[PDB]
Assembly symmetry: D3
Homo-oligomer: 288 residues x 6
């Protein structure tokens, strides 16, 4: 009828998802107890749902679009495949937020010599399927011990030999006698489309929105760079700076949009390569 996008009502991803669509010029109020939100201008419905529920909402065709993190998505996918189904979706694109990593962590007072060493041990996790996929590929077998939270109790509680969990600061692990030891999966939010024939009108809108998304992400990653054309050694410049648009050379200088960040290392390289008054300006919005 109109476009149905499903997003996390409340958590890690909901702020960034309200923002993405706001930056794509979607006027809708989310500060409301209401869970399906009609859009003001564009023919769009935002279902505010549990992150957990999004993969399935899309897999089942009950909504058209979903912003969900890869891990939650992939885990449910593997889950159903394991019940014997064949759930199907399109990944429109990987988003620029919701980063996190799933990791093997083990007791601190024990030396770690590779995943092999976990063969036949007991691993407590909330991601049994992501974990199983990983050790399977690696030929390692293990006994799963599932917990939906506080996974870091397992070892010190006699429940498991190691855990596999979401990490970022590393704080909890330490607090719990654990240390990261191998990242097994890195995830970000991504934008997925439902399976099956999608009507010309809402497809055109999916397509429109998508182009805004690329633009919003491009603008916040890309940057405007202004250096000093040390004329001779000029080729060795453009290399460290994957341009895509093409430099602009000036008599008096350089000016180009750089899709990656100027990491300090990359700046130092230009330095001791002979470039000067290097600048980097913010870009607020961009088409391209």
């Amino acid at each position: 009828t109109r476009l149905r996008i499903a997003m996390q009502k409340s958590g890690r991803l909901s702020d960034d998802s309200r923002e993405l669509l706001a930056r794509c010029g979607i006027k809708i109020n989310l500060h409301t107890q209401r869970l399906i939100a009609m859009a003001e201008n564009m023919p769009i419905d935002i279902l505010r749902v549990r992150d957990d529920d999004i993969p399935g909402l899309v897999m089942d065709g009950v909504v058209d679009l979903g912003i969900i993190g890869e891990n939650v998505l992939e885990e449910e996918l593997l889950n159903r495949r394991a019940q014997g189904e064949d759930p199907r979706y399109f990944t429109l694109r990987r988003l620029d937020f919701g980063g996190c990593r799933l990791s093997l962590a083990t007791p601190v007072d024990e030396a770690w010599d590779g995943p092999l060493s976990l063969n036949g041990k007991r691993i407590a996790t909330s991601y049994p399927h992501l974990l199983k996929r990983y050790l399977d590929q690696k030929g390692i077998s293990f006994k799963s011990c599932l917990l939906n939270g506080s996974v870091e109790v397992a070892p010190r509680a006699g429940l498991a030999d190691a855990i596999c969990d979401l990490v970022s600061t590393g704080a909890t692990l330490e607090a719990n006698g654990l240390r990261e030891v191998e990242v097994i999966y890195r995830s970000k939010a991504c934008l997925i489309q439902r399976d099956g024939e999608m009507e010309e009108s809402k497809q055109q809108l999916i397509d429109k929105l998508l182009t805004r998304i690329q633009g919003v992400i491009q603008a916040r990653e890309s940057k405007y760079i202004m250096m000093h054309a040390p004329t001779e050694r000029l080729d060795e410049v453009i290399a460290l700076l994957p341009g895509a648009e093409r430099p602009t050379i000036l008599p008096l200088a350089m000016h180009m949009v750089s899709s990656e960040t100027l990491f300090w290392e990359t700046m130092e390289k230009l330095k001791a390569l002979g470039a000067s008054s290097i600048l980097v300006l913010p870009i607020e919005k961009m088409m391209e």
Copy 2:
């Protein structure tokens, strides 16, 4: 080795569970990122875990004691029974907190004539097993639609004909075009014991702790009551006031501990029955 109690790390029940054990004189710090907490005095470990994980922790024998709400507990129990297992636990006792009710709610603009009317409709819930038990008993069949949150989207989103959800204020339902319509399950926290032979020493401690629990709950429900012995009509008094301990009559008056509350209705009854200067004093701690 020592007593293992499992409680909700963080949510609806964790404050009341920290408090119960505090009021039973269990010194342990919970303001710590650590998830298994050693007790200072008593030989006790508090595992701070996901509510979801507690029934199973107990069912599996991985801990000795669990404070968990009935619904979460019962739902997992029915779940495993449905996978064909026979998970076993003792209910030591139903606690005085964590009250909530699971309810059928349906769109506001539709008249409701009993659960029968749901036969063959689609009901969205997080408690498929509690719901299924209920309609099964009632001979009604239905198609389940499961969601782990924001269950109140279902109807207005075309996902279901009605939902079955946790309610208290009724706020969300309204916000979402729904109205409560039949409570199907009322729950409170309760205290459960693991199956199998329990060592004499920790049994003695379970037993000790339990007696404190009764005392803490008794003291906060029970009350000390002081009226005026309208001598003639004296029997019609003790009736509305289930005493258990026995009144105390005085020349000058009444004095007794009342296990229930003095609800206004009960006070008015004594009034127009001829009793005066009715008082009710708090009891802070009690044995009995």
Copy 3:
């Protein structure tokens, strides 16, 4: 149709008004964006409105009951009387909360010799009518300068010679070069009834509710007192302790409910009058 009580949606008085009715056993949810709240049990509607709007809501008969502070109430009353109307209401009773005082305050660096001295000066206030009533009675005339807030700018800003404002801690006045100097009106919340013939059924409910109110207030002001009957000098005791219910004397002692507080002065009087082990116990609920 059913009972309409009007209370402050949000501010100084709304917490205490939610509490009063809660303590009278009125189950209704206020944590809702909804402004007219149906009651669960009792046939009652709570309109959640602006304090400012309550006197008029009652004066006009648009609701049946109102919890409003005296000053806001009285000021609007004087206001309409001044437009020539004759607005009419019943004061059911003065409540035990929302205390505050309206005061004359004047610059700190000026000595104050009575209200007389304000004759013909300019006074800035939000309560022009309460102020006018007061100086009128006192035969003093003055020029009003009205402001709906930040009334304490007036003097230091050249707008007035003194202000008349709500005070409690006295903080703002100081911050603004002012000092209290005469309280002209003390107010509390009170409970008012609409004018005109009130149906037998809702009157009976007004009457019921009222009795609960007296009880709730009595219980939180009154107290249970236990001393030592210094037998000889026994009359000089009951005096400082306005009993209302009558002492109870015991061989071994005293026991009675005291409607006022035991202020330290009153305790010291009993002390150096020869009484010992004086106690004061809380009363949680009372009929009487």
Copy 4:
């Protein structure tokens, strides 16, 4: 003596007004209980007052400058005109903040066919004069029902047939069985000057400050734009981009300051018109 600006002590507008003057380089501390604030550098006094009080403060000449929202301003103006006065002020300029709209809203379950349909109905509002002006112009008459808050009770409470209120998200209306239906007044903060001969010295300062204001607003609305001069179709570019300053064309490109925003529609137009690597950079401060 020195410049007196009156601003909202606390609310919707005070943050933006502290910011405007801060961005104009007015050093003054507002984190103080004090309500008239002397400026450090510039000969300026900030009176921190009730928004309600600002129109009159200016209308009366008691201060020189006021930042106040249009609606509050206009309503008081109409108010006095209705008491027969002729209050006078200069609008220096409409500011870039404090946006909001006053709207007719009516019950959801009733179809709406224009303001005409309100003839002789009862409308509850806090803006009786703004409402009256509007229906008057439209030849519609109605009966006013005034409330200073919680205006959205009126209909569901039997007080009015419709309300006229400040709206933004639309949240409350829904919560209260209402829907927006016609905006009757859009407002922003604006900066007003007192009537009467204004001394050369403070006029020069009003004038100075004003120029800063234009600059601060310009910089946060205007933007720096960098495209690719698709040489042939070059005129069709500058059109969608009201420049004011004049484009800058470069051999290798475009560079100009655009006073409006690049709305997505405007970007898409340039796109399918043949422009590429469109950029938009922030401007922090500008003169011009």
Copy 5:
């Protein structure tokens, strides 16, 4: 001139000190940026100062009364004694709040066999004098390493072999590879009087206030106890219950004020000694 009491402006002790004097019926506003507060009724000044500054304020006679914790007090006392002075104060009384303990803590991975073992090691602390007093008495010498905060870095940073710090939950220590190992000083707030001849009038007030203090503390520690006189074994009761006031025996029972708490152990003792329906009621205020 009038009574000068010095208390902690802001921290661990200021809430309890505002409360003590409030419960003694001292009306004074502390919610003010002002640091010397005049009392409304009683001829009293509250200086709101740094805890650190209180011992000296009293030692020097610059104020009359001080609420300060023992450790801060004692440490400064030892400090001056060590500079060769002879600072003098009266301890009026030890208060019922501000408890905390100073402790030796050492790395977790090292076994601890008494303070002796610290001879000649380096101990980091904020309480060098309290620490020095303690090891001196114990005949142990050591090298001090002083830090005013984050004392728990010392060991893991190579700064010291152990630390001596304020502990309560034990949280930080763990977080920092440390474990408590010996408490060397327990402190509470106390109330101290300045040295030298104290005028009859303010002495009388110190004396008055003091009596209120005892009463406030008594009431919150003491409790009202109601059991069942198991007639025969009646002496073995009063023992576990240090009465001070004397039991009261009744035909039908016991009733007395108990200055200590009914710890669970003490309740269990009465239980298996044959007492029943044990109650404990709060006491809000008491003289005695």
Copy 6:
């Protein structure tokens, strides 16, 4: 072993210090109860300590680098010099944050005619050494009265004739009957290096980090400026705009990085000097 930087665990400076090193690309988690933090990438330890403790940590060689405010640093330096030591450190550089000023303030109701007038008066402060240095240079003598906080009580309490304190808004002073009267010391955070031979490897890192620091500070102070080359009067432009990099002149215009801010005065000067469409763009990162 690896680089040891000491920073304020918690206060005025810790946010800016977490940020500086974050902006220098130092990945380390500070949201941890742990006080010595290992760095992820770079061979670096962050000791999170008391600001008070930093000067000494560096002076003693116990750490290598310290971010500390000048006043705290200088005061401790003078302190030890006064105990007869000769503590030694290198100032690498003054940072762009933590600004504050120490000031003489005296009672409001007293006219101030220079520091001379303080000769032989009593001054209460937390910075006795900074104060003593200042009056010493000025040949004024005085009697110190030391307090570690709430220094603004001193005068109104009879403790001193004036105080010397940290000021910013000026709020407290007013609240306490005081007014600033002479700033005696302005401070910012700065970055200091430990004395003695610093190993080639960590020196190289100090050097690296330092260059990042200059860059981070440069980028947030410096700005990109775009005007209109009013060709004739072109020299009078570059003057008000200390360029350092050199302007860039364009046929059609100006473009340069300006290390200072464009203060309004400086913008107005260009204005009435004939420059137009002045812009100032943010710079996010820069080398140079």
